[PDB]
Amino acid sequence: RRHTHQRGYLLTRNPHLNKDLAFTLEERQQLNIHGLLPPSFNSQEIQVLRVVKNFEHLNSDFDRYLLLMDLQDRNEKLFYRVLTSDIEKFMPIVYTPTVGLACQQYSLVFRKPRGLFITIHDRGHIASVLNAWPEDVIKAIVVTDGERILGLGDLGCNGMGIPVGKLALYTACGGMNPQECLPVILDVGTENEELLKDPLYIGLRQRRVRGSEYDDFLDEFMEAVSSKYGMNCLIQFEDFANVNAFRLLNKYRNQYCTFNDDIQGTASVAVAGLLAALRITKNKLSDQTILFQGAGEAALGIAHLIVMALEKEGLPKEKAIKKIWLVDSKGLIVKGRASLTQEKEKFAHEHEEMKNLEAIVQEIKPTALIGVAAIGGAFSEQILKDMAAFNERPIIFALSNPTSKAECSAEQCYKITKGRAIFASGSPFDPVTLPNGQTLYPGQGNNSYVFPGVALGVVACGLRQITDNIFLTTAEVIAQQVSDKHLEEGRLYPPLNTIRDVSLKIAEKIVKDAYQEKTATVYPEPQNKEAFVRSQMYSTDYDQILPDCYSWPEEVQKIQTK
Amino acid sequence: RRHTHQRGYLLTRNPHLNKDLAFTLEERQQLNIHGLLPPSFNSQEIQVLRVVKNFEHLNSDFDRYLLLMDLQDRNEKLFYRVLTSDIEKFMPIVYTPTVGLACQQYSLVFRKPRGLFITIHDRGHIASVLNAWPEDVIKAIVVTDGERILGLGDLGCNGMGIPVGKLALYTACGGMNPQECLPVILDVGTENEELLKDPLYIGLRQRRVRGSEYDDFLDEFMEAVSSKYGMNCLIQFEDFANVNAFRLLNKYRNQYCTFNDDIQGTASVAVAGLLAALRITKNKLSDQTILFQGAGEAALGIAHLIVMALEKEGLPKEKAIKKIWLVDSKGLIVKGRASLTQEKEKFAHEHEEMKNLEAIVQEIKPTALIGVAAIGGAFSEQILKDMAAFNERPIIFALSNPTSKAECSAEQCYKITKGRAIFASGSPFDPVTLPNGQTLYPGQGNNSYVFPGVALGVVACGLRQITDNIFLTTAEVIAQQVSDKHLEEGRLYPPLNTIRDVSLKIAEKIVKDAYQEKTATVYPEPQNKEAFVRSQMYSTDYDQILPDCYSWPEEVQKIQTKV
Amino acid sequence: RRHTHQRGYLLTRNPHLNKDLAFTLEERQQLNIHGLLPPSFNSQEIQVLRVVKNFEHLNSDFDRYLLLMDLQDRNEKLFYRVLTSDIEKFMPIVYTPTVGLACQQYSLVFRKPRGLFITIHDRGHIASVLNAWPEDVIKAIVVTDGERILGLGDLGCNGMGIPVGKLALYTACGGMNPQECLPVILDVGTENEELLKDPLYIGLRQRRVRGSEYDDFLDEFMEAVSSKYGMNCLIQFEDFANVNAFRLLNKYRNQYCTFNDDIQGTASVAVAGLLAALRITKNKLSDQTILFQGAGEAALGIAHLIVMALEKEGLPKEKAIKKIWLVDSKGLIVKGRASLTQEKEKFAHEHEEMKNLEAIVQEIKPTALIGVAAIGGAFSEQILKDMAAFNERPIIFALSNPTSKAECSAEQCYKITKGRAIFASGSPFDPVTLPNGQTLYPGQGNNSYVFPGVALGVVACGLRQITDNIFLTTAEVIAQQVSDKHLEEGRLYPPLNTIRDVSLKIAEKIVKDAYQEKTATVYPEPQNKEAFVRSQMYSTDYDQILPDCYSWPEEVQKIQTKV
């Protein structure tokens, strides 16, 4: 498969090529590294066994995170192999919630750097900074400025842990080629006083640059990235602040192959949970009344994709909007209220101002209650009783992370609703057995269901713009993977260990549709779309890097002597 | 200083050149790595402040060891800067006793390989295995076959941790250039069934090769190494089995620049402690009567070096021998006894056989009692009581490790001998306070006092052979560094935190002597030997690696054009 | 512009980066090469002054060719700067006709290899041979199997000189980036016994493989190339045998971005000359009656493209065909005759057989007489006399090469036709002066007018297919660049020294048309097509290769320390 001119000691320092003890004797000798390794030869399975044994001997998830990061920086194939050996187990270590703790400690435990750092002071030279990255083919970028790491706020340059972790799941869950992936942090300063005082802070020790200077900096970054890597290069924004998140997305989405996972990714997984839920309530989306606790990026993204799902049912915009209510820290969003943004006003219905959520549930009497504001215990005992009275099967999504910030637990919800609640969360909960002897298994509205498959699909068929329809259709694909049996068990999402298959089926729909409606740019069009996607999916198998040896007929192979 | 052609990402992957955040902006830009690092610039001391802070959050010496090995494999300069920032703290983490536990878990915790692995199956091809090592200039090699890791037994290919750890001290304590150091393991197999059934064992899964197949294999190793790196390249044996260690040493020491630390290194440090003690007993070494508990590599080496010291005073070989007595697992070593060897018989005096150590002490009535048999509490209350009766100031060396294998504690030794005992150990004991107000600070007979300075000295002056006299003279230098005050405080060795300077003064003597005795091969002869050695010592300061920029007169610098 | 990680000696060995004495002092120091070059610094024009001076001291075009190839393999920028400094002078040295003589001596004079060699014995492994080429981005390939080097025959693997030479013109005349160009030879053997007995022959010493083994081998080549470099990669066939050239073209032209220059390139340039001539005859192409001497790759290609031009005027396919007549070695091509082919029969009109060219002319009474059969003096005094009688301004193209194979000279053509003939040739003739005071400057139908501009155009807009209409439109563009003044001077083509701009205006049209007709694959669509193409054109100015240096505010640039 592969060819390389790199040899000797330096080869072992390249994590894309390094196989450690998986190198055969033949390989070692041919590559000039025989003697640099112990005289044992391991299958990949033995390599995993060793890593897992070290993994289980550690006493915290943080130490486990550090282990797996070292492994990535040493042997890329073995890293992803381990991740895919038990994806449910290793996802929450390399990504949320553990990665968040890593970001908090990032300046302290900073050792082997990952990704690319671009500062405001590199303005007018971003192109030159990109040239420090040793990979010339990039198809997927995750970028953050570190101002709103989910539930942790502004961590500045320390937020670099997020793109790295996220891309690890691009590859592990979606089969994206990691060498074609680029983590990026945009350091324009920070408003975190603790980091401004920390002598170990690895980022710019300055306040955040705002206004036009920041806007132009972002413009240059979009230009630099697309100019070098091509307009087909996917560019995903992550953990920007509310205002800049929406502003940047609307500005770039119709000229660049870009999207924001916090807004659009969360929207897709949240909607997927609803469609799956409708198969239990056996009613339609138009029969629903949706109450959001939270009116941030996720809430507005979800609500927007809910509207589009209603339009798909034929229901026009102005009527679809009226079924959706949002609440923030100042109270319910209503017409004429102070402290409102453009994106909030479009859900500001004429209604008496309200502040207390308990009262709001009792007034609105919604069918679906979706929490994303990270208010731990917001769905109090009275909330759940009320919901269980207003609806036969109340839909309760407590998507806030981590568990300490969850709106309610699974036990707490099923207990009080006496088993009739339709439940999903963002943090994981153990199954719950009821007095009737029935057991429920609430699922996780994990964003990982969405972005890997989308990114694989977009990149595979060469889609140049990512429309809201991609995410709506993606949500449908996820809901389709849920069996009626899973629903009867209380699961609203596919099992986590099937995440790679989900990602595949998501990407297939995109590719199939893209060639159908002529939005694809990759040609010639493949006969089989399913096989076409698989062909581009990263394998955890070690590639051969030895040169292809083959002979010629001796007559023309002989050395001439005259 | 140095100029490198390496650039970009691969440069950051070189631990010899990589400075991490110590790279200035200019450097990052000129080296094509700007953007690969966070936008902060740290001094070296700040980098230290980051590592130590990570270090303190760890709950075991093993995890501490792992942190430092990671650092070594990332940024060599910073590693050594951390090591030298508190040598007494970090020495027992990277080397004994922690490195021993690391060797046990080596196959489990194996990640970034260090050093060079050579196997009996590479027989006839050792020269080519050497070429896999990316440094062409080697001045110091440490080699083991893992058969007798001290106190831990046969750990086979997992013994690679020892050479690596020891060379960290060559550099940290002796200023040896780490790029010029080569850790080697010779894997001929292992008799450890525990590793032979461990699916994660990184070594050869076979029994140890013995006899002529092994002997011939070592002969090629010495040939290949001396051929490639030159005859002046220092080759130190470590943790070989008892019989092999002696056989190989006598076979190679006259032709190759080689020595065994377990034997010759331990001998030098033990003798140094005695010379120091003489300044307390205020008598000479010819007045002493030495009893050894143990008759292995260390004991016989120490015993041999005491004779040399005695010969230096004026005694012949025969008389000096009779002042030394050995005991092993089968009892006292005397003429006629069964189960004797070549070096043991050399000390087998005509005497009735004995086995009980108390009785042996009572009979011989020795001045100095030395223990190196790793038998905890061997120096009983009775033995200490007897020694304190036969002598005003009995010399007691409990050199075995770790503390659990120490012949006695400093607490029980001083107490029973009523504060009169002159005590040293291999493991570290806290100070002991006497009822008379005095506090005694028993020192530690670390091998690290010896091998770094010797290696630096031998290499700097290009000495081709390492004689016993190098070690005797080294022992003198070490004792000379102990002040009269330290002796009255009960210290037989200088403070470990001054190990750097001790290594220097050792290397100095070797160089001075070698040029005077005409045994040095490095020329021209330097005028100042002190400054000469210092110039050869590794610094933990970051080297400049940018290209030398400098202008020329504008007249001849200008671009010529059509005119 | 670009940033390279290559440094020191190896950097000087890269002809894409090496500037020789144009390296400033700063560059030399920063690139770690200071001292490897003499202490002088030259501008690019001085470097030119050195090469040309060496150039002029040579006594043969062959030695001149060698000098320039050495330069190419040393310093790519300077090579092309020299080439473009007098394109009319250097074109016939690096490409036809000198490159032909080089191909003959190629095995003898073989030194620094250029391009990529792929053999029938690499069948099944072509993809891996491709990986040996150090450039991963390829936008233009020129391939030959050496079977029919124009006028020279089967030179086998010695034909590698042609792709190499032609691509030098892609870059020099068209601004193609040479790092993105790949010369290829397909060695399937040779029928040249002279090379088969030459012990110095660098190719396979075997007979040519034919049939399905050859057909399948080409199929893999196109697959491997399109797979690795993308379907948008331009693949130009050159100097293939007659039957293969047509078969492969019709087989691949619809699926791959490919074209044959000998057929389609020559057709475009020939048609361009006719369009120019029409502005002198002041009639339309449908009024013409064309007689070809020759019925090979060039003739049939030209003939096919004339029909397309006629179809564009308003005629159907059938009527336009009857205005064209072909003659080959067996005589006139008519319905019923033996020894006909697929493309020849397409022009086989119902007519009595003929063989004598004078009689053929007398019968058909053509307006345009075109020769491409490489038969010197075929246009006899009688033929020229007849043409000047049948026509007021007879169009005479003697396109064969070299001069010794020219159907007639400009001197004898103008003279006999009494200065009324409209004349063009493939070889260059000096101006001819008429008795009426007028001097005529007969132009040259070089293929170099066509392929560079086309290739630039196709690649810049990502065109997947190359239609006949690209070549017709190109022919129009070329003729449009000839002024009325030039036509009255007797020139049917623009000055060769303006080939750069001609290639630009060709590429422009292709791009403009492709975006309008929706055949382009490069997006976003540029607003200014002219500036777009210029931005893609290779410059002979040295690129900056030093790293971008720039400071940050002192506050955040400073090294943080313990405070």
PDB file of C-alpha atoms in Angstrom, chain B residues 336-490:
ATOM      1  CA  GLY B 336      40.688 -27.415  52.560  1.00  0.00           C
ATOM      2  CA  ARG B 337      36.986 -26.581  52.550  1.00  0.00           C
ATOM      3  CA  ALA B 338      34.766 -27.850  49.734  1.00  0.00           C
ATOM      4  CA  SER B 339      32.836 -25.674  47.272  1.00  0.00           C
ATOM      5  CA  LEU B 340      35.669 -23.184  46.696  1.00  0.00           C
ATOM      6  CA  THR B 341      36.572 -21.210  43.575  1.00  0.00           C
ATOM      7  CA  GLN B 342      39.611 -19.513  42.035  1.00  0.00           C
ATOM      8  CA  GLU B 343      39.368 -16.140  43.786  1.00  0.00           C
ATOM      9  CA  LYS B 344      38.055 -17.580  47.068  1.00  0.00           C
ATOM     10  CA  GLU B 345      40.917 -20.049  47.501  1.00  0.00           C
ATOM     11  CA  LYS B 346      43.230 -17.032  47.249  1.00  0.00           C
ATOM     12  CA  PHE B 347      41.918 -16.058  50.718  1.00  0.00           C
ATOM     13  CA  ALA B 348      41.526 -19.581  52.129  1.00  0.00           C
ATOM     14  CA  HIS B 349      43.661 -19.522  55.287  1.00  0.00           C
ATOM     15  CA  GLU B 350      44.541 -22.590  57.321  1.00  0.00           C
ATOM     16  CA  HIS B 351      41.834 -22.634  59.979  1.00  0.00           C
ATOM     17  CA  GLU B 352      39.111 -24.897  61.392  1.00  0.00           C
ATOM     18  CA  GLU B 353      35.806 -24.638  59.529  1.00  0.00           C
ATOM     19  CA  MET B 354      33.072 -22.390  60.930  1.00  0.00           C
ATOM     20  CA  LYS B 355      29.514 -21.497  59.930  1.00  0.00           C
ATOM     21  CA  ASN B 356      27.974 -19.382  62.700  1.00  0.00           C
ATOM     22  CA  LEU B 357      28.716 -15.695  62.083  1.00  0.00           C
ATOM     23  CA  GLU B 358      28.708 -14.751  65.791  1.00  0.00           C
ATOM     24  CA  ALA B 359      31.367 -17.375  66.504  1.00  0.00           C
ATOM     25  CA  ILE B 360      33.376 -16.369  63.442  1.00  0.00           C
ATOM     26  CA  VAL B 361      33.434 -12.783  64.742  1.00  0.00           C
ATOM     27  CA  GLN B 362      34.372 -13.897  68.252  1.00  0.00           C
ATOM     28  CA  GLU B 363      37.294 -15.953  66.930  1.00  0.00           C
ATOM     29  CA  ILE B 364      38.759 -13.511  64.412  1.00  0.00           C
ATOM     30  CA  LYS B 365      38.051 -10.377  66.468  1.00  0.00           C
ATOM     31  CA  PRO B 366      38.081  -8.112  63.387  1.00  0.00           C
ATOM     32  CA  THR B 367      38.410  -4.332  63.326  1.00  0.00           C
ATOM     33  CA  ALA B 368      36.250  -3.936  60.213  1.00  0.00           C
ATOM     34  CA  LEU B 369      33.105  -5.937  59.513  1.00  0.00           C
ATOM     35  CA  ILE B 370      31.766  -5.641  55.946  1.00  0.00           C
ATOM     36  CA  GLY B 371      28.462  -7.096  54.722  1.00  0.00           C
ATOM     37  CA  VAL B 372      27.482  -7.546  51.078  1.00  0.00           C
ATOM     38  CA  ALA B 373      25.485 -10.798  51.126  1.00  0.00           C
ATOM     39  CA  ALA B 374      22.034  -9.176  51.212  1.00  0.00           C
ATOM     40  CA  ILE B 375      21.007 -10.857  54.471  1.00  0.00           C
ATOM     41  CA  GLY B 376      18.892  -8.500  56.573  1.00  0.00           C
ATOM     42  CA  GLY B 377      19.801  -8.247  60.249  1.00  0.00           C
ATOM     43  CA  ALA B 378      22.885 -10.456  59.875  1.00  0.00           C
ATOM     44  CA  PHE B 379      24.683  -8.079  62.236  1.00  0.00           C
ATOM     45  CA  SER B 380      22.838  -9.171  65.373  1.00  0.00           C
ATOM     46  CA  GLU B 381      22.818  -7.431  68.750  1.00  0.00           C
ATOM     47  CA  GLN B 382      25.510  -9.898  69.812  1.00  0.00           C
ATOM     48  CA  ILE B 383      27.802  -9.216  66.847  1.00  0.00           C
ATOM     49  CA  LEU B 384      27.565  -5.456  67.382  1.00  0.00           C
ATOM     50  CA  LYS B 385      28.168  -5.986  71.096  1.00  0.00           C
ATOM     51  CA  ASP B 386      31.274  -8.082  70.422  1.00  0.00           C
ATOM     52  CA  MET B 387      32.690  -5.666  67.836  1.00  0.00           C
ATOM     53  CA  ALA B 388      32.294  -2.802  70.329  1.00  0.00           C
ATOM     54  CA  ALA B 389      34.258  -4.828  72.899  1.00  0.00           C
ATOM     55  CA  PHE B 390      37.131  -5.921  70.646  1.00  0.00           C
ATOM     56  CA  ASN B 391      37.491  -2.387  69.278  1.00  0.00           C
ATOM     57  CA  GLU B 392      37.255   1.173  70.553  1.00  0.00           C
ATOM     58  CA  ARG B 393      35.882   2.294  67.174  1.00  0.00           C
ATOM     59  CA  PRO B 394      34.596  -0.787  65.314  1.00  0.00           C
ATOM     60  CA  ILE B 395      34.118  -0.196  61.588  1.00  0.00           C
ATOM     61  CA  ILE B 396      30.750  -1.520  60.408  1.00  0.00           C
ATOM     62  CA  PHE B 397      29.777  -1.489  56.734  1.00  0.00           C
ATOM     63  CA  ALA B 398      26.285  -2.820  56.048  1.00  0.00           C
ATOM     64  CA  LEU B 399      26.437  -2.223  52.302  1.00  0.00           C
ATOM     65  CA  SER B 400      23.607  -4.511  51.192  1.00  0.00           C
ATOM     66  CA  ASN B 401      20.408  -3.211  49.572  1.00  0.00           C
ATOM     67  CA  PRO B 402      17.676  -2.330  50.001  1.00  0.00           C
ATOM     68  CA  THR B 403      17.051  -1.373  53.644  1.00  0.00           C
ATOM     69  CA  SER B 404      15.142  -4.633  54.145  1.00  0.00           C
ATOM     70  CA  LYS B 405      18.324  -6.521  53.226  1.00  0.00           C
ATOM     71  CA  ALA B 406      20.620  -4.304  55.324  1.00  0.00           C
ATOM     72  CA  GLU B 407      22.832  -6.229  57.753  1.00  0.00           C
ATOM     73  CA  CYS B 408      21.757  -3.683  60.386  1.00  0.00           C
ATOM     74  CA  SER B 409      20.220  -0.230  60.729  1.00  0.00           C
ATOM     75  CA  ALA B 410      22.222   2.844  61.724  1.00  0.00           C
ATOM     76  CA  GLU B 411      19.874   3.127  64.704  1.00  0.00           C
ATOM     77  CA  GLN B 412      20.667  -0.292  66.188  1.00  0.00           C
ATOM     78  CA  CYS B 413      24.357  -0.169  65.240  1.00  0.00           C
ATOM     79  CA  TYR B 414      25.158   3.138  66.941  1.00  0.00           C
ATOM     80  CA  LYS B 415      22.953   2.334  69.948  1.00  0.00           C
ATOM     81  CA  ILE B 416      24.433  -1.067  70.802  1.00  0.00           C
ATOM     82  CA  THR B 417      28.023   0.062  70.188  1.00  0.00           C
ATOM     83  CA  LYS B 418      27.206   3.102  72.342  1.00  0.00           C
ATOM     84  CA  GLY B 419      27.842   5.587  69.556  1.00  0.00           C
ATOM     85  CA  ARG B 420      31.405   4.374  69.009  1.00  0.00           C
ATOM     86  CA  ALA B 421      30.827   2.410  65.800  1.00  0.00           C
ATOM     87  CA  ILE B 422      32.005   3.882  62.508  1.00  0.00           C
ATOM     88  CA  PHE B 423      29.068   3.081  60.248  1.00  0.00           C
ATOM     89  CA  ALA B 424      28.352   3.148  56.519  1.00  0.00           C
ATOM     90  CA  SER B 425      25.639   1.504  54.429  1.00  0.00           C
ATOM     91  CA  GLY B 426      24.547   0.981  50.835  1.00  0.00           C
ATOM     92  CA  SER B 427      20.995   2.055  51.616  1.00  0.00           C
ATOM     93  CA  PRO B 428      20.279   5.519  53.068  1.00  0.00           C
ATOM     94  CA  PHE B 429      19.532   5.858  56.784  1.00  0.00           C
ATOM     95  CA  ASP B 430      18.352   9.014  58.505  1.00  0.00           C
ATOM     96  CA  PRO B 431      20.629  10.715  61.062  1.00  0.00           C
ATOM     97  CA  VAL B 432      20.846   9.159  64.522  1.00  0.00           C
ATOM     98  CA  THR B 433      21.112  11.213  67.706  1.00  0.00           C
ATOM     99  CA  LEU B 434      23.268   9.976  70.575  1.00  0.00           C
ATOM    100  CA  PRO B 435      22.446  10.417  74.290  1.00  0.00           C
ATOM    101  CA  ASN B 436      25.532  12.652  74.574  1.00  0.00           C
ATOM    102  CA  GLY B 437      23.987  15.370  72.410  1.00  0.00           C
ATOM    103  CA  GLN B 438      25.885  14.397  69.268  1.00  0.00           C
ATOM    104  CA  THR B 439      24.026  13.565  66.071  1.00  0.00           C
ATOM    105  CA  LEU B 440      25.621  11.194  63.556  1.00  0.00           C
ATOM    106  CA  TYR B 441      24.948  11.298  59.797  1.00  0.00           C
ATOM    107  CA  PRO B 442      25.850   7.860  58.401  1.00  0.00           C
ATOM    108  CA  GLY B 443      26.902   8.136  54.751  1.00  0.00           C
ATOM    109  CA  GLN B 444      26.055   5.931  51.788  1.00  0.00           C
ATOM    110  CA  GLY B 445      28.476   3.776  49.783  1.00  0.00           C
ATOM    111  CA  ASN B 446      26.947   4.459  46.371  1.00  0.00           C
ATOM    112  CA  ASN B 447      28.799   3.192  43.309  1.00  0.00           C
ATOM    113  CA  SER B 448      27.860   6.518  41.722  1.00  0.00           C
ATOM    114  CA  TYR B 449      30.779   8.098  43.601  1.00  0.00           C
ATOM    115  CA  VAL B 450      33.143   6.120  41.392  1.00  0.00           C
ATOM    116  CA  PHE B 451      32.114   5.150  37.861  1.00  0.00           C
ATOM    117  CA  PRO B 452      31.183   8.595  36.521  1.00  0.00           C
ATOM    118  CA  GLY B 453      34.478  10.255  37.454  1.00  0.00           C
ATOM    119  CA  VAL B 454      36.553   7.259  36.327  1.00  0.00           C
ATOM    120  CA  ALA B 455      34.789   7.045  32.968  1.00  0.00           C
ATOM    121  CA  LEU B 456      35.261  10.775  32.378  1.00  0.00           C
ATOM    122  CA  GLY B 457      38.939  10.537  33.336  1.00  0.00           C
ATOM    123  CA  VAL B 458      39.726   7.448  31.247  1.00  0.00           C
ATOM    124  CA  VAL B 459      38.040   8.886  28.157  1.00  0.00           C
ATOM    125  CA  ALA B 460      39.343  12.462  28.388  1.00  0.00           C
ATOM    126  CA  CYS B 461      43.005  11.371  28.360  1.00  0.00           C
ATOM    127  CA  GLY B 462      42.437   8.406  26.036  1.00  0.00           C
ATOM    128  CA  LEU B 463      43.574   5.777  28.507  1.00  0.00           C
ATOM    129  CA  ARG B 464      43.679   2.351  26.827  1.00  0.00           C
ATOM    130  CA  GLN B 465      43.721   0.209  29.980  1.00  0.00           C
ATOM    131  CA  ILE B 466      42.020   0.565  33.364  1.00  0.00           C
ATOM    132  CA  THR B 467      44.293  -0.741  36.109  1.00  0.00           C
ATOM    133  CA  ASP B 468      43.442  -1.493  39.741  1.00  0.00           C
ATOM    134  CA  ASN B 469      45.556   1.529  40.597  1.00  0.00           C
ATOM    135  CA  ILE B 470      43.020   3.805  38.902  1.00  0.00           C
ATOM    136  CA  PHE B 471      40.451   2.596  41.435  1.00  0.00           C
ATOM    137  CA  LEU B 472      42.749   2.766  44.453  1.00  0.00           C
ATOM    138  CA  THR B 473      43.754   6.324  43.525  1.00  0.00           C
ATOM    139  CA  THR B 474      40.099   7.172  42.957  1.00  0.00           C
ATOM    140  CA  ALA B 475      39.291   5.826  46.442  1.00  0.00           C
ATOM    141  CA  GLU B 476      41.974   8.129  47.849  1.00  0.00           C
ATOM    142  CA  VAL B 477      40.517  11.138  46.014  1.00  0.00           C
ATOM    143  CA  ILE B 478      37.035  10.404  47.381  1.00  0.00           C
ATOM    144  CA  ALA B 479      38.253  10.109  50.974  1.00  0.00           C
ATOM    145  CA  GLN B 480      40.304  13.292  50.546  1.00  0.00           C
ATOM    146  CA  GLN B 481      37.047  15.147  49.852  1.00  0.00           C
ATOM    147  CA  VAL B 482      35.715  14.318  53.317  1.00  0.00           C
ATOM    148  CA  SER B 483      36.505  17.059  55.834  1.00  0.00           C
ATOM    149  CA  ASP B 484      37.553  16.403  59.428  1.00  0.00           C
ATOM    150  CA  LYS B 485      34.219  17.962  60.441  1.00  0.00           C
ATOM    151  CA  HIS B 486      32.255  15.397  58.414  1.00  0.00           C
ATOM    152  CA  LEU B 487      34.089  12.527  60.104  1.00  0.00           C
ATOM    153  CA  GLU B 488      33.219  13.834  63.558  1.00  0.00           C
ATOM    154  CA  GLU B 489      29.651  13.992  62.254  1.00  0.00           C
ATOM    155  CA  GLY B 490      30.046  10.314  61.330  1.00  0.00           C
TER     156      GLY B 490
END
